[PDB]
């Protein structure tokens, strides 16, 4: 029940509206603590409209649904990469990796690869370090690194 | 005549291969494409049978999976594939001590330098994935095994 | 290997074939034209004779053998017999291979087209000559001579012709025939000798008289006087040895025989004797040319070989012909082979060579090709 | 170890015989496909191997191992033998006989230093010019006491096995030997002689032993004789500088059981015609020239002659001398030779003088200028000298020559004599004396040769020259061709018997006739009544007849009548010949100069009568043979000739006589045939002159040889044998095992092959193959062999790819995730909430 | 065992048989042709003689025997006697069992066809020869001689002929016959000697005188001169011993008896002497050939054996014949056996071998087969 009950919490903190719906002021007011601003009209509401009425957490779940669609655990991913790397923890070779995405199977574009690079995709030694990329995105990112 | 299962089984092996090439289907892999699943027929069969003029490479053409479908069966359907028992007799001619040893190099060079070759790594690798050892190697054993296909059980 | 070959000139005579290679002065091979086998044919103990060679052999062979002449009167009556003679000339005498050489054969006056045609086929089919020609015997003779104008008296074996030529042209109408020649004389002589109480019926006996005619016979300055002289004549009696061993004397007969040419009445010919026919021929030609004819007339053939022939002939001719008119009588030294030579030339005519008849022509047209629009 | 080879490859005895295992192994699988690779006719070389580009119609387009393109003819191309064949012992084995095939094999072996090949019965050995270890006594050890199959071709074999055979089989045996100079023909005779020596002692059986008197061993016994006899015989023909005039059967006989009893010599063939006459770059027997030279001069004087070969007509007919000779030295030698054989010089004086007597008879003229018809002697110089040497009365002799008187129930005077005749008696006289001398000599060797040791069964040896063809063939040639023919027919008949026996034994159906017989029509034409020979002879009778008459006779009888009888056309120039024949043999053309004239043998009775008196040797020879006696008119003979009506007998009749005798013996004993060759004009090893051998082969008849082999079903194998190799061509599931019963499976292969039955037949034991089936078979295996190779390679390829595969699939899922998740990322990073959530979480405690 | 066999050549002479094996230079067998029994036939004590063998036996037996010649004048009149003789030839003289050997018989000129046939039937049926031939005696002799050409004078026992031959051909028409020959001459010597007062009637005596004919006689250079010389003749008086022991003289007689050939009128034959018959024979031939015939005159037969015969022959012809003519008389030295030798050539003639008649031929066609198309 993890994740959603997890979500359930996130939703309620902001709530305190009545009854449990997290409606516009909640959102804005959350920001203050948050403590970053917060376009207080408009934008916030537009956020609402992807959904059809007040939410209520359940629809909060349902709205999310795209998020569920692709994404495997965490784990399993590593996982897929691991298959790539004959060597150690070392890990995946840069030049291999570009080649394996880009010309290979479902092709990354010229730009598409580039975006990833530009974000940099922490890397050093002229290579790559995956775990820190996962730390940002899938783990969600909760840092990275100062 | 094949038959859903079947051609469809051929299809998804095919699917991945397309996926590799980027994502579309060469023509060329062809022989390999449904060598993988089982018919032996060799370059000259491949080349004429449809890859391109025997398909040195790209980008002369592209198959595609469905066309490739009927190929796999007909280009199959012969039969004379080849066969462990028959091979041995071939192997034996070299063997010359009838010992069912050879003579390991002789051996690799035979199939190499003979008939069509047959690259060095490929030869070297196969024999000792096949795992029969050097003094001297049952060319009959090696053939009998390798024919049988790599797994066995 | 320049290009060009010989020509086999075969001349088919009524009594003698003459043949050789063109470009030669005279026929290398001359042999009797006959066919003959043991008339009696005894048997014996064995064999090794040839059934009808005739050829040279016969003449030595006299007494055993028989004669036939396929070409008896100049036209070849018998083909089968004919084939063999050609075989003899090629193989036996000439020792040549017919395959290799173009061959020129000659034929008689008034030879039928069919006759040429039979000849032709035999040459090609039987013999395998590459090439073949058929030549007009008198014409060859004309060729040999070399004279454009004038008039010729050809008396050989068995016919005697007077033939005016003006600019190479034998005026056909002018031309005269006498059957008489010298086969007849041979025959005549047999008769005359017999009256004395000598006999020469036979074939062997035939040859003998011929020998006597050719060695002994002569033509008189004047027939009438000659008879007159004979009585007191003492030269006339010369003697001849027979093969038998016995000896004949030939007094008057010597001149008597040839007199016949001048006087055909001897044998029983109605014919005008030679001088008259000559004259008849010229008058038959246009008046103007006659001057030339008279000046040039010209003896040919074996039967014109008698010494005394020319001198008389002018004597006779002058008598017939007009006062002022000039007369010459010409005779070639080796007249008899005049026929062969003439052929020898025209077979041997390189410039003319296109004339020769080909196997292809024979195939395409037929043998007739040689006949029609050529020789 | 494996290889078709035994004992020790390396050991030196082996190398002529063996081939080393390695050499064989390399040899057998050199490349080969029948289809292109072939032979083409080459104007110069003979044939050449080459390969085919292209075909259409009669013309074929081709490339050679001189690699130009000629377009030969369809027939004119020659299919080669399959690879399986090469390095092959017995050429007969070869599936494709063709001449360039023929060159290839023996050529290939010889360079190899392999001299010997086996052709059917025949054992051919080539001349290595170089020295070869083969001869070694170590090798001998390998041989002796072995069967011939057991080792590759060698003399010691033939000598041995025959030795055994004589004992077991208890029969005489024979070997023939051919070889021109550079055969090595002589050595083998040494080699064999010793061989006799080796076993003749050996025994296992006891034959009468004595301590012994001696006089030289056999072998030497023979050898001592040689030089002199070949001085006098021997000579230089226009062709052949030293060609023996005569034919030697040298008889070594043994006892039942293989003791050697001893030896004797018989001679046949003396063309006396040389004696008077010689043509061109040729001359008489050596001696005439020799005598005349100045080694000898005491002898010349006994002769009463001025030493100068020119001086006399009998001699003078041809040229005086030849290079490379020295008459004098040879004179010295021969006098020495005469000594060594060890007679007793009086006989020498003796033997000289009487040959000498011949010469004097050479002197005298013929005339009394034929009063009227008869010829009477002129000079009586020679007759007295003649008279003297013999010791006979010159009044008599002269008379006897002048007019011989003879006998019947009453005696008649042989009027008989003419101017033309007489001389054809002086020469005959000369020839007779010489030959009688030769013969008397021979018997003497036998007395000497007589050893101790008993004999039942002998082996050995015939020597006379091989078939010849000349620009100008003549009486000499035709006879030789005649002799060869029947011989060859003899051979054909012999094997014809055997094969059908074998066929019968196996029980495969035989339909054939004796192989010899096909020829018979030809020889008959020569031999039989109204034959060319017979016809010629009686033509001889007619006093009248001439070349032509003879000519027509043959023509009438034969010309066109037989395909055999044909004639040369005139060409330019080139040649003149009366007629040509087609012996088995190949064709031949002959011409006349001589023969009837050459023919005339007449006996002169009274001379023989006269001759009977006086000098001791003379009485003996003329009286009759050596101690022995004869018979008369009771109970003989066949129209043997005896007189021939009058004038004694001709050559042709006697020729019949001899040959019949020869045949009688030969067929008595079991033949073996050896042919020795010389490879090529310049003497080098390896080497093969294509033209020379080819000519050799037809003359050899070896090709003929091959032709008979065509006739039947050559290739034979066991079924079991057949199955083992061939099956790879047509496989089935069931294990080779001896699971597949040999009978069934081979049945299965053949029919499933769909060969027609005609080609082969079964067979309890063997399957009978025709020409060519094997050729088909071999070829197909060749093509088969390749394909599976490629197919294995196909297999190996699959191996690679299949193995790739799992790695590939494995990657696929890894990849798939990669692509989508990042893609998941591409949107997320933008979408506000996602970002916020990530920030929000760490807020949580 | 190759093949082929002998031929039994027995020449049936009017007085002598000569028989032999083919390929023999001359006959093994010659014995008389007579049949004869003891005339008186005394009886005796015992027997053991052979009645009419006549054999050789008769000759030594002279006085006792009668004689008969079945073949008296050359034609076998008496088959019964003849069978006796042939039996003798085969078994007794030759000792050869006939069935084994093909036998060639000679036969007289103008032997009747029937005569020929009767011979055949006997050989096959009586003797059982596998094969046989009949041949002609004159013909045989020509064969032995080997003269293609020339005229032959073949005087034998009792016939004499002149046969001009040209290329192996007896010319039938030329041929002259003579009754006269040895048998006649033998009588003549007999009668003449009796003239002296000697008496030689008997058979025994005839044998005797024959002996004197063959030893003593000769022919003269010139008859007339010799006779005249006879008066002074020291030489003639040669003597001859008789078996009785008495010695008789001859020598006028020596030449006179032979002179008969030249002048047959002596005995009373009108016929021309051989010299002139020769001339007549030649004249009967054609002239051309005659030259050869003069050149080659060959003598034949026993009655031409007299010495100096040729020289005389030479002179006589020279006398008759033409001035220039070349004349040569050739005589074979053992001329009498010319007939046998003769058969010997033909008999052992293996090309010709078919010519022998065979049993089947005898059966199918009959004996006449021998006659009718062959010999
Ligand atoms: N010297 C000569 N004298 C007379 N007549 C001759 C002479 N020479 C040949 N003849 C004859 O000439 C005739 C052959 O002449 P030829 O011109 O050849 O005749 P054709 O051409 O008609 O056959 C024969 O009758 C022959 O006898
Ligand atoms: N030397 C001789 N001199 C004379 N007459 C001889 C001589 N020899 C044989 N004759 C005779 O020849 C005759 C036999 O000759 P031949 O030719 O055999 O006759 P035919 O053939 O007619 O029987 C007998 O009369 C015989 O006396």
Numbering used by the authors:
A (entry chain B): 25 to 170
B (entry chain C): 41 to 193
C (entry chain E), E (entry chain D): 1 to 375
D (entry chain A): 1 to 845
Pull verbatim passages from the article behind this deposition:
The sliding force is generated via cyclic interactions of myosin heads projecting from the thick filament with actin molecules on the thin filaments. Myosin head is an ATPase, and its ATP binding and hydrolysis regulates the cyclic association and dissociation of myosin with actin filament. Upon binding of MgATP, myosin hydrolyses ATP relatively quickly but the hydrolysis products ADP and Pi stay in the nucleotide-binding pocket, and therefore its ATPase cycle does not proceed until myosin head binds to actin filament. Here we report a cryoEM structure of the actomyosin rigour complex of rabbit skeletal muscle at 5.2 Å resolution.
The helical image analysis produced a well-defined 3D density map of the actomyosin rigour complex at 5.2 Å resolution (at a Fourier shell correlation of 0.143). The helical symmetry and axial repeat distance were refined and converged to a subunit rotation of −166.67° and an axial repeat of 27.6 Å. These are identical to those of F-actin23, indicating that subunit packing interactions of actin molecules are not affected by myosin head binding. Each myosin head interacts with two actin molecules along one of the two long strands of F-actin as described in the previous cryoEM studies. The tip of the helix–loop–helix structure (I532–H558) of myosin L50D binds to this site with conserved residues M541, F542 and P543. A mixture of charged and apolar residues of actin form hydrophobic interactions with those of CM loop of myosin U50D (M:Y412–A3:Y337/E334, M:V408–A3:A16/P27, M:K415–A3:P333). Two lysine residues of myosin are closely located to negative charges of actin N terminus (M:K638–A3:D1/E2, M:K639–A3:E4) and another pair of lysine residues are interacting with two actin residues (M:K642–A3:D24, M:K643–A3:D25), forming intimate electrostatic interactions. In the actomyosin rigour state, they move further away from P-loop by a distinctly larger movement of U50D than those seen in the rigour-like state, making the nucleotide-binding pocket between helices HF and HG-HH more widely open. Thus, our 5.2 Å resolution map suggests that the nucleotide-binding site of the skeletal muscle myosin might be more open in the rigour state than what has been described for other actomyosin structures or rigour-like states. Hence, this clash of CM loop appears to be the main cause of myosin dissociation from actin filament upon ATP binding.
